Amino acid sequence: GTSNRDWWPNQLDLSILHRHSSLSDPMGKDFNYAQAFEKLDLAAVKRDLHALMTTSQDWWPADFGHYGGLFIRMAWHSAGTYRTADGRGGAGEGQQRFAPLNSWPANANLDKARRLLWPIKQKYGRAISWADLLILTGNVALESMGFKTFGFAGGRADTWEPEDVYWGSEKIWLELSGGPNSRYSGDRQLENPLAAVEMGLIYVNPEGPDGNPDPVAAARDIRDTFARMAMNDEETVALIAGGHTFGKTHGAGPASNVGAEPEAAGIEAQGLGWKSAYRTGKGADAITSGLEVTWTTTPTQWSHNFFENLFGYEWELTKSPAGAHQWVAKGADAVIPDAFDPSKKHRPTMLTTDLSLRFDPAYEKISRRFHENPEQFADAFARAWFKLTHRDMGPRARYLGPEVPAEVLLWQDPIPAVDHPLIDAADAAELKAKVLASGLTVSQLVSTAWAAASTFRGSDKRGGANGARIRLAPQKDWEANQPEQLAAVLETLEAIRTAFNGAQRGGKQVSLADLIVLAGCAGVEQAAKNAGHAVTVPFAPGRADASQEQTDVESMAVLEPVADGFRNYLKGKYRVPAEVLLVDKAQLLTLSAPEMTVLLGGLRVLGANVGQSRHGVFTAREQALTNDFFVNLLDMGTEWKPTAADADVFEGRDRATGELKWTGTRVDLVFGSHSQLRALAEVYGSADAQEKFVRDFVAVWNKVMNLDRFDLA
Amino acid sequence: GTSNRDWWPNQLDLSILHRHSSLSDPMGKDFNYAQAFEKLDLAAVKRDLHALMTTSQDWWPADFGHYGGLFIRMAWHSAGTYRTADGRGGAGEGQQRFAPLNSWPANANLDKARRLLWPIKQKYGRAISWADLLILTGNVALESMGFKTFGFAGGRADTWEPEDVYWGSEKIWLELSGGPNSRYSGDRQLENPLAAVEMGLIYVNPEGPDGNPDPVAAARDIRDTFARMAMNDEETVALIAGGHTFGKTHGAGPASNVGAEPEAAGIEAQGLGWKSAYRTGKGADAITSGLEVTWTTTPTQWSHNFFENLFGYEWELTKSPAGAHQWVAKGADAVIPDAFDPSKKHRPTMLTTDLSLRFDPAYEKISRRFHENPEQFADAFARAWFKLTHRDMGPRARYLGPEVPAEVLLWQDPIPAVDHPLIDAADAAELKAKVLASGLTVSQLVSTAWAAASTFRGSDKRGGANGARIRLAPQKDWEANQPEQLAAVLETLEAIRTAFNGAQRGGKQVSLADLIVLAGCAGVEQAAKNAGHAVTVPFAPGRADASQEQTDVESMAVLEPVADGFRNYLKGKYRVPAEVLLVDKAQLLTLSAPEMTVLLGGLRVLGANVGQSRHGVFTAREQALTNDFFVNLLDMGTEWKPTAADADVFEGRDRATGELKWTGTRVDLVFGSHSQLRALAEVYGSADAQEKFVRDFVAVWNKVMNLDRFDLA
Ligand code: HEM
Ligand code: HEM
Ligand SMILES: [Cl-]
Ligand SMILES: [Cl-]
Ligand code: NA
């Protein structure tokens, strides 16, 4: 069946904005996962998971009698798709159970791990999501084998379909670099937003870069991909050595024995894949990666044996039974237990990527420090494991249950507690009138509040106006935020704040975070009034101001908008058309196509454009909230042509007289071009639509202002 | 960006069931189009459309100063995508404005027509849908040129994204037959459900079959395609000769002058396409089809000239200025007006497909009859135009406004008016108890009501339980309906009905249509009771019984389920896997994936399978409403293998003992295989879900029972 994607493969795809609809969701529209989880007996789930660890099923027998290792790997791969560049991937939506992740080669036989968990899922039902369960399983595995974890937060709601994520352009699993869809260029530069070295891998190739078993060059790949997952060198060493303290790899026989991945398997396989024709196809005969390494003398118990082995022996390159490169400690004694035969023992072995921890000079310092001080290793690993598995959960206000760690971590972009009365509706009205009487314009007020709130992304729930981080480094200096204009607006707002807070009794005060948002609401209300309409924009106080010391400047860099179509802004020239970047932004803001459409048309006429550009400002009443953008965009009396100087800027001229009327970008004109967006623009451009436009505008404005307000959830 | 479709192009696509979500819809969730249109001043719209007909815009000048022809064509192509096989296509959703139909070659320069209508759309806003406006414009064109139409109904609500339709497998526009994706096989057999001869055409190729200008062979294609759009010979001749009484074709120069279709054009084209480099690119220089034919001496006025010309001349094959095959009248004088130059005239001309109306023996008789009796022609055309443009609107209860024809037409599958008091809740309780006391089983009651209601399809809003057509030819004899079992159920119900109606005072009575549905409800209630749950099933009376004479047996044939996964039924072997057919049926019933999931698991355990097959009946308590199907499907204790005799039937055996537990089909096992369906199965299979399953089941049951209840809308 030939589709629209076949005929017009480069048209813009809006269906990414309409995923996660009430139609695909089996739970009722009032189902609240946090309320369900808050009543789960978490201890009882953990007791059942502890019992599972040593309850082997014959269809996938447990190595050494213990599934710990398998489940740790599972929870690390659930979390390890995360990319800091866009916040997509991670464990927070349980996406490992859907395509494509359920069938990535690096996820082989994690289908078995997830099936082992079905009896417990089934028992507790909707009170524990698959997403939470994957991570809790990992934690209980660690605890069962003697490792004390840093804690655990529930609250990851299940999703019901695949997320739309750019995982790369390769058309072949595990394609080595420099092919026709190479994700690498230049001096081994990985393209943003990707965070893995090959299609279907989590971070790196365990044999070495494109299969070359050089521990030193592998270290470079490790460092680059982990950094793109927001982990530094200390976290990286702790996580890899930590994880490889447990379990084993599987490569008992040749890879050509392994059949189709789950999404390609037959129906009889009932959601499992990678069925193997090698001997029994499982247990002692298992094939997963093709490597056959067991790192420690006690693979079912926490120890410091990984670093004892890594530094205590000299290593020799060898091949697994499937032919993959690995390392062995020649002239070690056979001290490693076999997974199934009590009478066999083996020599210590390592992956190329394990030896990286010893032969990269920066890693070696850390690994030596951990080797000599295993208590420091255990602490670092616990913290890094918590970060790994929580990094995409959002603000601490979303963390549920009795095991949440009380320590506030810098990476969490923490927001201080509010300990005072909040402003009420009368106070808000008074502050709004002061803001408007100060001389701040509609444009300044809407631009500033937009800049503060629009850093939110739903992928990892980072960003938003809570914290007033717009006043701090680095946000205050981002080009899109117009630093000089910004600094003058914030100086005026801070004087209003100081005056108002000074006049209060009884502890009442307003945060700068709240006032930024409230000032934005006042600007929207004034715009409406300028157009002849009396509207109240809703406002919910309770934001707090974070300090510079509570703000990791380097981690904030990934939230800088380099493209924001809502402000007609592009920081440089990109391979991706600006309209595709607009839709990507809308997706991160959690907007539907109608909401993206209303919001952009309004912003245009309110003066939100960076640099006060006239592009797309299709009105003669700038700073009045009207549907002028749409009515003028859709006027067939104007003809549009790209400019000589820039093919991405367009002149609109009267079709009869030739007179210049307007200029716009691709972001503006896509609303007149794309057949689905034009259909939405037509609604808002109709003669009966003024009231609808204003109402839908205020609602989507308010939605943006509240994107990070999990304290009110 | 590589997608799931790229990696696993044969996995099942569920996103067709979650289309038309509240996310993509710009109107509020309580927007009711029928109420909006009922307040439109239809007369005022029609005045504006009359004015438009002769208001020529320079960007697309009006042929002969009148856009009527162009608008008639536009309305006929809006309607002319309809296929009776599935009810998909047609004018009823205004899909012409979306991909792919907005860019089909046969729709060239209809983008211009629709843009001419933007000022009117804009003026009336949400009170008139594009879907309705396309047809109304057609009607007004006809009236403006002197033809009296049969009437007009509003009520086609706009849609906001492309409908999912199989339009064929060809990868090239206009591909001639016998290619690698040929829609033809055998002795020119067009594949169901298609109703056009080539990809991008409405019905047939105007030059003749695969471009061969044989009017006799073209007639064969015309008759086959029109029949697949529900039109017989008389309607076909009337529509083609009716339509070609007006306007002209456009082929002034070579087709290589014409540029990209709308979905391919640049952004500056603002939603238009087919820009032409030939001379002025428009008006006298227009190029649309490539053909250059003007049929009548007064192309802007109703006349009897089409048939006078077709029979009054002998025809000679010639070529247009673009090189297309067409015909010219031998020895005729130049009597046809030019569209733009008052000093030029032209000889009569015709398409190959026009000459079909004379050289096919059956068409010739009709065309002669119309030539000799122009009043019969005019009436047949009016009737056929109303059918064409209303065929996919559904029951007369959906028809809005003051121009609706009072005459009831057989093709409308009419339902008689109810003229007596309806049963109330006390009566329904009494009838349910009689039904249960008669000895009818849960399985008989659920199967019957399912058979009656599940003929509904949302594509053209045909079918459903209203009418009691299950008791009439041909439904009573369809294999999926189990004719012998069905006859005995209906005999029992009709005795209960006769007894009840005989006891009533005043004119209260119950229809057999209502009682079938009510008996179904009683069976679901009894099933719930069998499982230990106290459940009332909602029931809305008001269905009436249609007669045999109100039921066109040939037109009902397209509603026969040859595949119904909900009854584990397949009539024969098809190219399409049975699970794809299941999803297609769910789409026609308007079901979401969760609703399809719940409904099939329930039906299985209630005994709805055709022929009492055990396939998928994963319970030991058949006829009890439980979640057993899901709990047993997902039990990893069971292993599934395809059988020796049939690879589409599977055996489930205890994984340890080898003992046979169950059998199922691909439709059963797909819920355990496909990662999104299994995710939904897991919700209903969990230990906390029995009450949720029963509740969700009753809701989806009731939805299906009410699908055709536009009298309650
Ligand atoms: C550079 C980073 C890493 C590489 C290249 C990598 C590579 C691999 C490979 C190839 C396997 C074998 C899969 C098989 O054949 O069964 C595996 C196993 C495992 N990895 Fe990693 N790993 C990485 C980091 C991590 C981290 C961060 C963790 C957790 C903190 C983790 C925990 C595990 C565990 C527990 C197993 C054992 C599985 C079992 O016993 O079934 N690894 N690793
Ligand atoms: C076998 C069926 C038919 C064939 C093959 C066909 C073919 C065509 C073609 C090729 C054109 C020229 C497009 C262009 O170059 O502008 C056209 C024009 C037109 N057709 Fe048809 N036609 C069919 C049936 C119909 C029917 C059923 C109607 C309406 C009841 C209709 C009404 C029109 C009208 C009004 C035009 C004139 C457009 C104008 O003035 O711009 N035709 N037809
Ligand atoms: Cl994601
Ligand atoms: Cl359709
Ligand atoms: Na994410």
Ligand code: NA
């Ligand atoms: Na339809």
